Each structure stands twice: as C-alpha cells, then as structure tokens.
Write a protein that binds this ligand. Structure first.
Ligand SMILES: Cc1cc2nc3c(=O)[nH]c(=O)nc-3n(C[C@H](O)[C@H](O)[C@H](O)COP(=O)(O)OP(=O)(O)OC[C@H]3O[C@@H](n4cnc5c(N)ncnc54)[C@H](O)[C@@H]3O)c2cc1C
Ligand SMILES: Cc1cc2nc3c(=O)[nH]c(=O)nc-3n(C[C@H](O)[C@H](O)[C@H](O)COP(=O)(O)OP(=O)(O)OC[C@H]3O[C@@H](n4cnc5c(N)ncnc54)[C@H](O)[C@@H]3O)c2cc1C
Ligand SMILES: CN(C)c1ccc2cc3ccc(N(C)C)cc3[nH+]c2c1
Ligand SMILES: CN(C)c1ccc2cc3ccc(N(C)C)cc3[nH+]c2c1
Ligand SMILES: [Zn+2]
Ligand SMILES: [Zn+2]
Ligand SMILES: [Zn+2]
Lengths: 230, 230
C-alpha cells in the first residue's frame, strides 16, 4: 500500500518462536506489497553499549564525557558512528516499526535496549522540548511483539507478575510515545515454551491474521490509565 | 559485623554525578568498615549481549540454540564464560548489591541490562523452585540508585512521565524480587543536570547520609500495591 515497515528483531535462533513470528511478519507484509526491512540485531552483532566511540568528531567537552550531550551534538554535525545512522535511516523511512523479542527481565533483551539507547538520540527522535506528542517521530507507528516465559495468568493484576500492561510502560510510554510514536496494541504471545503444539500454532496464526488488517488499526491511548487502570 | 557490598556501576565518566554517587558510596561504606567491591561495567567493557559465547565448550544442543536452557545447564556444569562467573562470585559474597546508574529510557543502560540478563541465570539467581520470596538470592539486599533527566514533578502520577514507581516495577519486582532480593527503597536523584550546585550537593549529602544507616533499613514491600496503588 506504499507502506514501509522496519522489524527490529532480537533473538539468537532462527528456529525460535520469535524467529517464526518474525518470518510470519515478513511473509505477510511482503505478500501485501509492503516494503519490509529487518534489523536482525544478533546477526549484525549490534553494539549495545553507549560509549564515546559513538561520536567520531571533536567532542563538545573532551574532559568530561556526557553521552546525551555529545550524541546530540554529533547527530547535528553528522559525526555519529555509522551503525547508528544506518538504523536511523531505516526508522526515518519506516511507517511502522515492529519490535520482535523475547521478554528479558520484564523488558527487552540488552542488545535491543542498546538499539533504543543509541539509535533514538536527541535531535533525531526527540528534542528538549519536543517530546511525547511533540516527539520527532510523530506520524509513525510502533508495535511491540513480545513472547514471555510467564503465562497469561501470571501476568494478571492478581497474578505474581502483575498485569502484562505494567511492564509495557517503560517501552511504550517512556521510550516510544516519548519519541512521538503512536503505539499499536502489543502482540503478546504468552508462554510458548510450555504451550501445546495446537496452542503454539494458534499464537502464530493469530499474529499472521492480525497483520492482514494492521493498517486499519487505531493506536492505543498510551496513558497511565491504559497501563495501570483501574 | 562485616557486611559485604557490591556496587554495579554503569556510567562512562568518572567525573559524572553518577561517578560522584558511586565514590560517595565507596568512601562511606569503606569508612564504616564494610567490604566493598565495584563492577565498573563500561571500564570492564562488559559484554551485554546474551549469546552462545556465554557457554564454554560443547553446547547441550548445537543445532537449536536456547539461551535460557543452555545457561541453566552451563551453570550446573561449571561451564559459563568467566566474565559471568566472576560477577556471580561477587554477588554470591555480597550482602547488599547497589546498582548505580543514569535512567536510560525508563530503565537501566543497556550495558547494565546485559549484566542482569547474563549474570542472573537460572540455577544461580532463581529456579524451579525458588523465585520471588524464595528466589536463590534470598537473604540479600538490593538497592537502585538512579539519576534522571526528568524532574520530580514530571515523575508524578499525573505528571507527563507518571510516578517514578511505575518504571521501577520491571527492575525491583520483575528482576530483583524475582531473584529473591529484599529491595531497599530506591535512591532517586532527580535531574541533577539542571539542578543548582547547592541542590546537587544536597542530593549527594542525602545519599551519603542515607548510607550511614543503610543497615538499619526496612526493605519496601515489593508489591503491585507499593508500585501502583495509593
Ligand atoms: C535472560 C532471560 C530473562 C528472562 N526474563 C523473563 C521475564 O522477566 N519474564 C518472563 O515471563 N520470561 C522471561 N524470560 C523467558 C523468555 O521470555 C522466554 O523464554 C521467551 O519469551 C520464549 O521465546 P522463544 O522464542 O525463545 O521460545 P522458543 O523456546 O524458541 O519456542 C518455544 C517452542 O515453540 C516452538 N516453535 C517455534 N516455532 C514454532 C512454530 N512456527 N509453530 C509452532 N511451534 C513453534 C519451538 O520449537 C519451541 O519448542 C527470560 C529469559 C531469559 C533468557
Ligand atoms: C540514552 C539516554 C536515555 C535517557 N532516557 C531518559 C529517560 O527515559 N528519562 C529521564 O528522566 N532521563 C533520561 N535520560 C537522561 C539521563 O537519565 C540523565 O542525563 C542522567 O541521569 C544524568 O546523570 P549524569 O551522572 O550523567 O549527570 P552529569 O551530567 O554527569 O551531572 C550533572 C551535573 O552534576 C555535576 N556533579 C558531578 N559530581 C558532582 C558532585 N559531587 N557534587 C555536585 N555536582 C556534581 C556534574 O558536573 C554536572 O554538571 C537519558 C539519557 C540518555 C543518554
Ligand atoms: C511459566 N514459565 C515457563 C516461566 C515463567 C516465568 C519465567 C521467568 C523467567 C525469568 C528469567 C529467566 N531467565 C533468566 C532465563 C527465565 C524465566 N522463565 C520463566 C518461565
Ligand atoms: C527535565 N529535563 C532536562 C529532561 C527531561 C526528560 C528527558 C528525557 C530524556 C530521554 C532521553 C534522552 N536521551 C536519549 C539523551 C535524554 C532525555 N533528557 C531529558 C531531560
Ligand atoms: Zn504514552
Ligand atoms: Zn536448576
Ligand atoms: Zn516485588
């Protein structure tokens, strides 16, 4: 439909449940005629660490290194490391960014956290001021497709993990909404590692099926109320 | 009374506000007679990525790589990578683990997320059974000392960031409580970057003064109610 999709994918194993969800996404969006790009972070050996190597030009303050300050200035000067600007090009061109990952400690795997830390820099993804609904990636969509060890039941208000929406807050609100994304409803595939084959098949089909009508979805209200209720 | 403290520290710059807070902790805990160890992650060029390099020798299934399974087995077989087991030794010996870090996207910097992902493996930090109250690090204390870009006001329930307790949930509950830590109240130093020198000195003194009686502290009730309730 003229639409461009970036999938940022964070799993080590192509045959994994995550690998299958990523491939289903590529297959279905490709079938629709979408332009599709995948950043396979582990295969890229993507650098997760925020360091002074991310700036190649003269530092604003070479005596006391401030990562946010220096990357902001390097973005404006175009002296960021090229692995960062490679990702920024993908994001800039994308209409929808899908994140495909296993839940690691109620969050993204570190290699994907590094992508968020390094790619979404000041000047590119937001400004101060110029964030949340004024973020610089406004007009773009984002979607978290996450798999969990824990069951849906564990991820309820009265379950040991609390509601699943609780752990989405830093990702959907603190990061994506902050940068101006509108956020589509998460795809959460609960506990595939202990699900039956039928249940596993059912979770993969649910995702493929959803993707058929993804461009007709409205985003969530990315608010404290949506995440926490009551 | 010989208490052992591990400080896991994630900042690039010794002269930073985080650097000063880390140094205050070392100084004060050292003064008290405590045994103190610091894992300076950036200085160590600590590996954040969860990969098959974290298992030495032969994988337990060389055709389909499952990080969780492989590291569980490697832990039991004494064949984890030495950077991991070095950290596990420090944690094993510690009575208190302090994490010192700037807030990156409502969470820990990726290098510290990588520490959590790779060090806190099944068999070491948790198991079936042994999680939440019975996690394998029960008896230990953990404390998050965080600095933010955003103001205290932004981190209120109706402020644009929401309550700071909202972003603590994945860290304190999903990670630390899950491994059996009792969680000490977080230390949150709001917006040192725009604070006055006097305000900044006050935040450092608050931390130094808190450390004087840290062994007298009651842990928080690490509950959904604490994080999300009234
Ligand atoms: C460091 C770390 C931290 C973690 N922290 C948390 C946490 O805080 N909370 C939590 O809930 N979980 C946590 N987990 C667990 C983790 O989220 C799950 O193990 C992960 O989400 C499972 O996804 P996967 O792709 O690895 O599953 P896989 O093990 O790859 O897949 C599960 C099963 O599905 C099968 N499968 C693959 N493709 C298909 C297909 N096409 N059709 C049918 N079946 C298929 C696979 O063969 C496998 O048998 C953590 C794990 C690690 C390693
Ligand atoms: C990738 C990224 C993502 C981020 N995401 C978020 C986010 O989601 N939410 C949010 O709120 N913020 C976010 N931030 C901002 C970040 O949390 C703050 O910039 C950081 O906490 C500032 O801490 P610092 O140690 O670097 O401060 P510094 O810049 O090092 O210090 C502030 C001032 O204190 C001074 N100082 C140092 N030592 C002392 C001392 N002993 N006594 C008095 N003054 C002293 C310093 O010289 C400096 O002038 C993000 C930043 C980055 C880079
Ligand atoms: C009901 N099931 C199957 C679950 C439920 C919760 C879980 C929580 C985890 C936390 C960390 C972790 N690793 C560090 C590997 C693996 C986990 N596996 C889980 C599996
Ligand atoms: C009240 N002030 C000054 C603030 C408030 C919120 C902020 C949020 C941020 C998010 C990411 C980031 N980086 C990616 C550098 C820098 C941020 N700086 C902030 C500064
Ligand atoms: Zn939001
Ligand atoms: Zn075990
Ligand atoms: Zn808890």
């Amino acid at each position: 439909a003229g639409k461009k999709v970036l999938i940022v994918y964070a799993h080590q194993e192509p045959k994994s449940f995550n690998g299958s969800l990523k491939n289903v996404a590529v297959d279905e969006l490709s079938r629709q005629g979408c332009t599709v790009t995948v950043s396979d972070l582990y295969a890229m050996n993507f650098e997760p660490r925020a360091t002074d190597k991310d700036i190649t030009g003269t530092l604003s303050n070479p005596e006391v290194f401030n990562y946010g300050v220096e990357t902001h200035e390097a973005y404006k000067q175009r002296s960021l490391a090229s692995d960062i600007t490679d990702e920024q090009k993908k994001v800039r061109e994308a209409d929808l960014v899908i994140f495909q990952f296993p839940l690691y400690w109620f969050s993204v795997p570190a290699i994907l956290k590094g992508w968020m830390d390094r790619v979404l820099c000041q000047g590119f993804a937001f400004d101060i001021p110029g964030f949340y609904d004024s973020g610089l990636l406004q007009g773009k969509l984002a979607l978290l497709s996450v798999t969990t060890g824990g069951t849906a039941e564990m991820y309820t208000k009265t379950g040991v993990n609390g509601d699943s929406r609780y752990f989405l807050w830093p990702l959907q609100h603190g990061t994506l909404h902050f940068c101006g994304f509108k956020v589509l409803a998460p795809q959460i595939s609960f506990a595939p590692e202990i699900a039956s084959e039928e249940e596993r098949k059912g979770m993969v089909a649910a995702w493929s099926q959803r993707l058929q009508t993804i461009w007709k979805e409205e985003p969530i209200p990315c608010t404290a109320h949506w995440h926490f209720g009551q």
